[PDB]
Chains A and B, each alone.
With several copies, the nearest count.
Chain A
């Protein structure tokens, strides 16, 4: 009932998705081998929405892992829960992309798309009725940016009505771990803005800033950053995984958050966030979390929300709590800070609650916001794109793969249009 198929494109997609099955398997009570040892009977109902039942009380996930280099598949297979994944989904080529969007989208990826398209035919048929696809990729690089967005277009041609949710992490000016970030980003958003109905824009700068102020981690690795983003992907897909007083489907947030088809780039966030050295000195009540919810330095995007205005926001709470004090809190943030909300909508806040919180915690929530502050991120990368594109630097490799400079100019026409769209409703 309302199944979801997980896709993991690119090196970041395989790693960010490996932690997604890590955290949700704990609250569901799934063994590392695949069996079930949960404590509550409520965890057994909606296991089909992400896993497939097997013999011997064993369960396997519907994870479509795809990449062009075999190193990421071997590392994930040797992980904590690497053995639970089925081997036939681990499709992979031999040669990597080398951070080239043209190779993994036209020439190198087209040799691999024929092998993975037949796999999703098997998984889409095994479920009763698919709800939406939860893809994970990164705009940086060529594999996840090129081959990841390719199958977005192919699947949308098959399913012109199903949901296509993606958790896309974008580049940033200060944190630049690759020289080809603006070109890979500019060509990817041309397709994501038209094809996908939902998009969660994540920035690596905020993942470093969020871990400095409140977690106080002195040596945070990639595994620490994955725990933050994986919890947001789990929090959004929790209402259709456990029962609650008001369950919100993934599509019910799409109807509330997406007032126009292109305007779907969301601001992810998470609460509570407190270090081990200050977890005891904090109140887990709803007034404490709500103030930290809409804090300027809480979301997973470097853009300041004070420089924009929220068009619509959501706070899907999670855990046993009284919804009376919730509604007063969402009333206060929109009333006390009405200048930072659009006047042409009466209420910019969505609500949702669940009864069974995660392990170790009592109450929690997850933030999803579509705001005008994101246009500062799309324009700065466009300046990076426009600075190098005007001299045609680092484009001769793209033309070798059958590309043309006209498509780069057409992608710029999509880039400068969507930033002006945010300027209209600001």
Chain B
């Protein structure tokens, strides 16, 4: 089992330097680059007593790449993998996909192919990006179209950071997401969304950290994407590979946007006073405010969800938990898929970063749950987009790049084509 990762934009590298921070600590890999089969799916054997990571950090702006090259994890990452551009995308889907993308995609695609050639058990891919930015929206849309025609059959995990309802870092980020989603709909197998403000109240309420940064955020997101692939690394009573998440979450080929939520998230002093068990975590993840995406689940119905655990967790009490959750009438599962449960157990417990705010726990759980609760987000993104689209604001840059109102009109009606079938299956 092997899988190749790729990080794009400012959002990717902060996830890159954070998510790879715990993988090298999980496998006992020192930061220098050296210390049997668990690390094979993310680290290769570099001759004798040395490793190299299976990732490519592409970015148009080199302001992050030189920081990593002058950082503490210099000897770990290969110097060729740290790809650099020439100039930033400027929050432009057009500039990051057409002008700046074409003159560098020929180098990135050849670099991905030569690394994929020596693979034998390449299960799929996982992409880290963000549609709200320029590089994460423009350049990621280019490679996803160009590699899908080449490989196609292999799976893909799009870990995209979405905009919040009221919180927003930029003003043109609806224009970046509305265009790229028109291309991401037909080629992306499954995209797990993340919201920026959804992390803010989590650490404020549960972790009681009142001045964290992205380094606290990405350490949590890096732990979330480590648990979903933890079955392939270490042994488990009920293992699940990368292809398992393609079938039990994507009932229709276009409805491929599951939510995500993770628990337990408890501080150091609070962990000892609270009892860690299977019951409360199985109830905590289904709590609506305990999600990584601020969307009301009660406004829709759940299609299917997977209960992947960690640590020494027996398989019986987890079955009693989901059985009790089925009896709770506060939630409501859809009649089209009532038995949408997928239990999973792993022996290797959650890790802990030295100095990190997250506390050590003997058991954990991660969740990917498909539901119709996301249609209100796309409805909200369409309504706010119509306010700017009517005045034709922030359009002269895109057509100044080469675009026009036609694809903008095709992107608007595509969400309208997505609104109808989310409401149809929600019945």
Contacts and interface: CB of A to CB of B under 8 A. Distances in A.
Interface in B18-67: 33, 44-47, 50, 52, 61-64, 66-67
A284 B48 CA distance: 10
B63 A261 contact: no
Interface in A299-344: 312, 322-325, 327-328, 331, 335, 343-344
B214 A323 contact: yes
Nearest to A275: B79
B154 interface: no
A255 B91 contact: yes
A251 B170 contact: no
Contact of B168 (A42, A240, A335, A349): A349
Interface in B87-120: 87-92, 114, 117-118
Contacts of A277: 79
A347 interface: yes
B31 to A, nearest CB: 15
Contact of A245 (B52, B62, B214): B214
Contact of A260 (B61, B78, B88, B393): B393
B167 A256 contact: no
B324 to A, nearest CB: 35
Contact of B172 (A42, A255, A343): A255
Contacts of A327: 167, 169, 196-197, 200
Interface centre among A2, A256, A328 (most CB of B within 10 A): A256
Nearest to B165: A346
B169 A281 contact: no
B171 A331 contact: no
Contacts of A237: none
A32 B211 CA distance: 39
Contacts of B214: 245, 323
Contacts of B200: 324, 327-328
B146 interface: no
B329 interface: no
Nearest to A320: B213
B128 to A, nearest CB: 16
A247 interface: yes
Contact of B92 (A42, A246, A255): A255
A331 B166 contact: yes
Contact of B396 (A240, A261, A281): A261
A87 interface: no
Interface string A260-273: 11000000000000
Nearest to A327: B167
Given A252-B90, A291-B114, A322-B213, A345 B168 contact: no
A415 B166 CA distance: 37
Contacts of B86: 1, 129
Contact of A349 (B33, B171, B391): B171
A46 B67 CA distance: 11
Given A249-B87, A327-B197, A243 B393 contact: no
Interface centre among A246, A280, A346 (most CB of B within 10 A): A346
Given A247-B61, A278-B79, A283-B46, A322 B393 contact: no
B50 A280 contact: yes
Interface stretch (B186-194, B278-286, B382-390): B382-390
Contacts of B117: 287, 291
Interface residues of B, number: 58
Contacts of B118: 287-288, 291
A274 to B, nearest CB: 10
B177 interface: no
A291 B110 CA distance: 12
B14 A331 contact: no
Contacts of A41: 70
Contact of A249 (B33, B61, B64, B203): B61
B134 interface: yes
Given A247-B63, A346-B174, A331 B90 contact: no
A14 to B, nearest CB: 29
A45 interface: yes
Given A239-B63, A281-B46, A324-B211, A350 B90 contact: no
B394 interface: yes
A165 to B, nearest CB: 13
A282 B14 CA distance: 26
A239 B63 CA distance: 8
A79 interface: no
B391 A425 contact: yes
Contacts of B92: 255
Given A249-B87, A331-B166, A258 B397 contact: yes
Closest 7 A/B residue pairs (Cβ): A322-B211, A347-B168, A346-B384, A259-B393, A249-B88, A251-B90, A255-B90
Interface of B: 10, 14, 33, 44-47, 50, 52, 61-64, 66-67, 70, 78-80, 86-92, 114, 117-118, 134, 166-172, 174, 196-197, 200, 203-204, 210-214, 384, 387-388, 390-391, 393-397
